[PDB]
A paper describes a structure:
Mtb persister formation is dependent on the trehalose catalytic shift, a stress-responsive metabolic remodeling mechanism in which the disaccharide trehalose is liberated from cell surface glycolipids and repurposed as an internal carbon source to meet energy and redox demands. Here, using a biofilm-persister model, metabolomics, and cryo-electron microscopy (EM), we found that azidodeoxy- and aminodeoxy-d-trehalose analogues block the Mtb trehalose catalytic shift through inhibition of trehalose synthase TreS (Rv0126), which catalyzes the isomerization of trehalose to maltose. Specifically, TreS-catalyzed isomerization of recycled trehalose into maltose is a key step in the trehalose catalytic shift that promotes Mtb survival during stress. Although TreS is not strictly essential for Mtb viability under favorable growth conditions, it is required for the formation of biofilm persisters and can therefore, in principle, be conditionally targeted as a persistence factor.
We initially attempted cocrystallization of wild-type Mtb TreS with substrates or inhibitors. However, consistent with a previous report, our solved crystal structures, resolved to a resolution of 2.7 Å, lacked density corresponding to any of the compounds within the enzyme active site. Given that TreS preferentially crystallizes in the unliganded form, we turned to cryo-EM to elucidate the structures of enzyme–inhibitor complexes. The structural alignment of the published ligand-free TreS structure with the solved crystal structure of wild-type TreS protein incubated with 6-TreAz shows no structural differences. Specifically, the position of the L352 residue in the ligand-free structure is stabilized by hydrophobic interactions with Y101, V138, H141, I179, F202, and A239.
Residue numbers in the entry:
A (entry chain B), C (entry chain B): 34 to 45, 50 to 52, 59 to 62, 65 to 67, 70 to 81, 85 to 102, 107 to 680
B (entry chain A): 32 to 38, 42 to 44, 55 to 70, 87 to 88, 95 to 98, 108 to 680
Write the structure that this text describes.
């Protein structure tokens, strides 16, 4: 008799295969069995082994959804409305970290088991890309059910257990949430194309003609030909700002707005602490405009921010906005209010300038965007991560008018080749350890809350051939064991093969090998993460670029405002050669720099230009004491 | 000063050129033709515009006596050192194919294309994709292949073009122009509603609204693949001129793709229309009149019985396609092994319709085709219809093109058994590149791209396929611990005599010495054991080639008593070892076989 | 029909296997063949494929040897009796570099093909471990024939071609040569145990008792029990200072001395430029002494040095001597003579102190041995290589009386574990790129001629399980191809398997990958090799350790004596943390340091302590101009 599941097979009056699972369902010739003569079983027959309240339900023409009271109440933390400024974020796919169910795909159940590593690393909050139920036609960003987590990951109660356990250690949880669109398979859309006179008939934008909203540009110009697609059911055009399978929400309907914010109370009611809003420059669409950054779109964001500010105190709202600095600051809100919209916006053109600066060996590309950066509300924080494109529209922020480097990125072969490809830090810097430590020093010292991608802390690579976005979404390399220790299942049943690259593969780089070795990149990242934790000037301090005699090196002091305030000095060399520089630190005369990693005392600053020397791509961190 | 040279090294141009394995030309920091539209006419080159390739002596039956080798040009060999397989690289590796013992090479589409659908979206019918080479490089290919007895056929999508085709750009821009009616256009979507959607999960309608022409165009496949109005007489002559072009260069034939969807009529399913066969009958006419001795193959994801008429009228001996493909073959062979019974194979043969005399079936070892990704099955005529879902392996590899070795868990015995059937059963066999050395599949990079991984030649860098940086490779060679190039490759397999490659070559060389495997009659022999499938391939006439093939489908040793009194007093000679077995009398001949084993015998006088 | 050679098999009135060889001999059933019916060949028979003036000949009781005039005359270089001071040596096994014969073992024939890489790297002379005919019972150090090169490597004419081609590019050739002993299989020994009254009966030390020379210690105390072994033929004890199969030469016989120096004229007459003398503290043995460093042993070395000085001008003589500095200086000769013995002696305890210094993060372990080092003749040069033990007796130089670190090496786990094991630089430093660049900066700047082991320039590792000495003797990793591009033959027929280690293997590190990448260790070594070439103060300059305010960093100036002399400054940090140091460079007031790799100009030195800053394990190289 054969017993099979697809990848693993075992041959055997009597009434072993389960023994790394308990939980499995067995059938024979399409018959759910619980002795062979009873079932007319003959030689060389086959038994199959398949896996075994959970989901919004459409009843009488109405899509019902459960409430947060139907599930367990997760314990929250002492409310600190300014935690997101001191936080270090860790973006990671649930699919890619750990597989506890041994089903080939990383699940929530694996995430709780790996929380000891993330605390040991020194992160303060985990950022989860969308994991709700979806057909996975656009990387989980085409939500099919807001109230149902993807079954391949787990159940909602597993999410409550994660928020609980991550909270017991002092770590928070945020997630993406697509605002502009849902998937075709969402019940709201299926009701619109079938019951126009029903309650969900105007939940989406419908028009008898395509010559409407013509001034808006097509984001995915290589795949889609128009933001209007002819639905075969309703016999009408529906508005999709991304792909055809992603119809845009009609926020012109107030029930849509009330439904979307209701989903926001649902997860906040469960215990989550934050949200990154995806595709928010496209909520509202009006004729004659580009259907982007409209004032009513910002008005809805203001309403959401209060709903949280009132009902869910101490939460955080982030904004994914592929816009040049000066246009994203609008999504912080009105400056006089001190923050009436998203608490955080991401400074996208940061590394695109940092990358070009170290290749041009000059600080000017970085000093420019910092001065050009507008001020933000005091209770707000810029979001700085080490990537060039956003994980929704693989495009880089640029401005023909306000970016002097606009025509210079294409003059870089590394930039011109990795266009539209999201890559990890190590392959972006050709695995140069000196540069990896340099880019990490900048990200952990520049004004704003840093975001770390999973795997960049040990030097993981990417399989770009697997996708321009999925290539960076490879399983986390834990051990040099099978499946990189990420799953104890068959390799052919995994969601994606762990990288077997000769230099970036799990056999060569993983947490186990780096953990058991000093001078490992993992220990470097953890050391800097612990150093930065002991100094709030790295999170809420004021930025001041200092006078230098050498533009090849970027130097700046971050000082916590007030007497006896935390004052650190960061010096970063962008040249591949040793460079000297005299510093204009006369503002801190009689201050004594103390290097942070080694606690080594350096000469006391005075009134003469302070002389430092750095190697190729080196950096220094001093504490300014008195 | 110091200088970086990148595509990284810190004279400079030459020194960088030599280290990259490329030619130089190929005070005064970093250092980094087909068809043409002439107003409103899309002019295309002619067959006389290039040199003529040397052809082979006219054989009106070679397609029957042939073993085909499907190879994606992007995957065999890279000579331009650009990371992708080109034409130029293929001609170098003709020595391996001639040594392997194939007869002709089948090439997936290589035309200029934006590669939005595996090169099946043709942007220009008269320009080879620049990464693959140029039209002049094909002439050298067809020439070089022919100087050694090897022929060339390629895919040719018939039903649709790419959206980027100049015919479609003039159709949506100049509706009153000469190309404005080269495609099907509609003002409503409620037309041809009785036709089913092929890609039901990707597309929601076979009509699509162009923003320029503000009209609905017909596409049987993808939105970038608009169907062609074959009711337009100029479309036909333009397409048969495309056929005239390559045949004038020297190609030995084509496979016509998506042909059951050419014409369209309201009230029908827009499939297998009489005008579609009437058109193909005219294409036959023009190839037999102008280029005698060429072959037309019909891609048809249809059930045997719904494909036989694509051969044409049997009275004429075949006035349409010379070849239709017998698709449900291995799905029954695969089921037969899991059933340890010969009924899944013996039943399809007992219900396969006749074919014209100058026709031939096409057999390949795959469960799904390359255009779509569906497994053919008929609720009425397939008695295994529902039992495929009762197989976890079949259920897992659904819509997934997978090679032979992963399908059979790399079981050497099973691979030899499937190879023996493919090379002995009636029909011209097709070998996918990699099945000869037991290559593996990557899967994760595409349902159809998983089998399109680079040819694993040597255990050197890039599997000996390219001399370029692995980053510039179009697809990385498989580094699987069992299926990788370090484990399986042409270099190692050629050495060890017990290798699969030496096995397949031995079968190819043995089959070449016996035409009964190609044009002989088929006669299943009654066996007392249903686990064993034994058949005879006999050539009509005295002293005709008569071979006996016995195949065991159980994983255990099995005996079999056979009915060979029609061949009394003969002597079975095994082909691989030329060992003489006892002469057959009036007794049921007894044979014993290992698990998943097979014997080939030659009944001689 | 089968055609086989052992690892590769091919099955086939007719009269392919040769096609990557021409050259092969074929036999069938022990019959040298040049049609099967002629030879009674049947089905399933087998044909074997075997490989096809060269050797000293023992005639009438006398071991005759050829002369240098019987072979081709290799062109020499313009005589420069001081080239060995400016030279950078590259020790490499012929067996391990390249296999041109495709026989599984690296040959001389491969060495000429790879000479373009060694010039491109920037070496000045190649050092070849012993390659004469030998039974390979002790790593080729048990010479069986001085006049016959090992056939597995090639012929003598292949050695003349190598000396020719290496000379056309400006590179020289030296080799080891065992002085104290030969192998049992040497014809001189076989004549001694068989014909005592013959000419070779007193070529070795024979005694009827073992109670002679009792005060000498046993080197290989773990394998041998006595330096006396009872020969079964002569029925007498013969003296072996190493292993039993290595009987010591009897230099008390003057014909032995004349024969040994004759071998020296043989290779120098061919065209070689140098010799490292192996086991020279054991030539002469006298009763009551330790049979080591005896004055008559030094007297023989003096005689040899002249024989070269007179007949072979411009050659070089090196001395392998596991002795503390102060005892090895004796092998330079009498200081007043200016050099009457070996031109070079190797400073063994260099890195043993350098290793302990960077682990103790203090310059004192290095500053001590330098001051304790005695002066040497002006026309002499210390030999500095990066290893801890010598490749003959896997032991480390130490002195209970004159080594203050004597009892401290065992207190280091890395040292205590790698005892008796010769390891490469990268595994010795845990593949820390910063430390590898630091140890290389010291070796390329300290007083003396540097010696580089093959593979350490790209970061190769070792397979210590293959042998305590053979583990470092793995094939050179050229390409990620089969056999690391070292041989185009079967992997099972290779002499040793190329390292497939996940981090040190050829797939991960090889010359091809490093050559095509900036910031690669190969390019670093080549850059430093080209920088040092443009500055003779790195070879013949005077050493002066400078006054420093921080013992964590080693600083020294190397100046070519005279006006406008070459003056470089090397600063080397031994701490894993950033460290500042004020330099006492008042001797070079108004001198301007110019960093060598980047040509960056640093502040002009004056009368105030000069301040520099370094990172963890960093180093700087400045040129002192005026
Ligand atoms: Ca919208
Ligand atoms: Ca190419
Ligand atoms: Ca059509
Ligand atoms: Ca001696």
């Amino acid at each position: 008799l054969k017993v099979s599941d697809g990848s693993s097979e075992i041959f055997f009056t009597t009434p072993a295969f389960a023994k790394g699972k308990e939980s499995l369902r067995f059938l024979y010739d399409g018959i759910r069995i619980q002795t062979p003569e009873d079932l007319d079983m003959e030689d060389n027959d086959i038994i199959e082994a398949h896996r075994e309240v959970q989901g919004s339900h459409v009843e009488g023409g109405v899509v019902e959804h459960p409430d947060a009271k139907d599930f367990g109440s997760a314990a929250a933390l002492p409310a600190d409305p300014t935690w997101f400024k001191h936080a270090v974020f860790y973006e990671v796919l649930v699919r890619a970290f750990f597989d506890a169910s041994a089903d080939g795909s990383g699940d929530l159940r694996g995430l709780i088991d790996r929380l000891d590593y993330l605390q040991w690393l020194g992160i303060d909050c985990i950022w989860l890309p969308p994991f709700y139920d979806s057909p996975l036609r656009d990387g989980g960003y085409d939500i099919r059910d807001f109230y149902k987590v993807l079954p391949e990951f787990g159940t909602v109660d597993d999410f409550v257990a994660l928020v609980d356990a991550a909270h017991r250690r002092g770590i928070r949880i945020i997630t993406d949430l697509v605002m502009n669109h849902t998937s075709e398979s969402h019940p709201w859309f299926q009701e619109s194309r079938r019951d126009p006179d029903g309650p969900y008939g105007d939940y989406y934008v419908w028009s008898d003609t395509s010559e409407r909203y013509t001034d808006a540009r097509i984001i995915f110009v290589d795949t889609e030909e128009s933001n209007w697609s002819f639905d075969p059911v309703r016999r009408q055009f529906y508005w999709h700002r991304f792909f055809s399978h992603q119809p845009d929400l009609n926020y012109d309907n107030p029930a849509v707005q009330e439904a979307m914010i209701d989903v926001i109370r649902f997860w906040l009611g469960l215990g989550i602490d934050g949200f990154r809003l995806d595709a928010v420059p496209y909520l509202f669409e009006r004729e004659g405009t580009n259907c982007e950054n409209l004032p009513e779109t910002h008005a809805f964001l203001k309403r959401v921010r209060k709903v949280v500010d009132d009902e869910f105190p101490g939460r955080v709202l982030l904004a994914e906005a592929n816009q040049w600095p000066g246009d994203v600051v609008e999504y912080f809100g009105d400056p006089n209010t001190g923050g009436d919209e998203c608490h955080m916006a991401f400074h996208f053109p940061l590394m695109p300038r940092i990358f070009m600066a170290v290749r041009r060996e000059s600080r000017f590309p970085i000093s420019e965007i910092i001065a050009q950066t507008p001020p933000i509300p005091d209770m707000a924080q810029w979001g700085i991560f080490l990537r060039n494109h956003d994980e929704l529209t693989l495009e880089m922020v640029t401005d023909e008018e306000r970016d002097y480097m606009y025509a210079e990125y294409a003059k870089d072969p590394r930039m011109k080749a990795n266009v539209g490809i999201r890559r990890r830090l190590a392959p972006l810097l050709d695995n140069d350890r000196n540069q990896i430590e340099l880019f990490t020093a900048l990200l952990l010292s520049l004004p704003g809350s840093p975001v770390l991608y999973y795997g960049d802390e040990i030097g993981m690579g990417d399989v770009i051939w697997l996708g321009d976005r999925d290539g960076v979404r490879i399983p986390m390399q834990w051990t040099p064991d099978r499946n990189a220790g990420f799953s104890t299942a068959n390799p052919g049943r995994l969601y994606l093969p762990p990288s077997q690259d000769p230099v970036y593969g799990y056999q060569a780089v993983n947490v186990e090998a780096q953990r058991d070795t000093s001078t490992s990149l993992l220990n470097f990242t953890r050391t800097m993460l612990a150093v930065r934790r002991r100094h709030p000037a790295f999170a809420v301090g004021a930025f001041q670029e200092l006078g230098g005699s050498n533009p090849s090196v970027l130097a700046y002091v971050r000082q916590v405002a007030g007497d006896d305030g935390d004052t650190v000095l960061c010096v970063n060399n962008l040249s591949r050669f040793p460079q000297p520089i005299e510093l204009d630190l006369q503002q801190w005369t009689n201050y004594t720099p103390v290097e942070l990693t080694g606690h080594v005392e350096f000469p006391r600053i005075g009134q003469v230009p302070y002389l430092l020397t750095l190697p190729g791509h080196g950096f220094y961190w001093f504490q300014l004491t008195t």
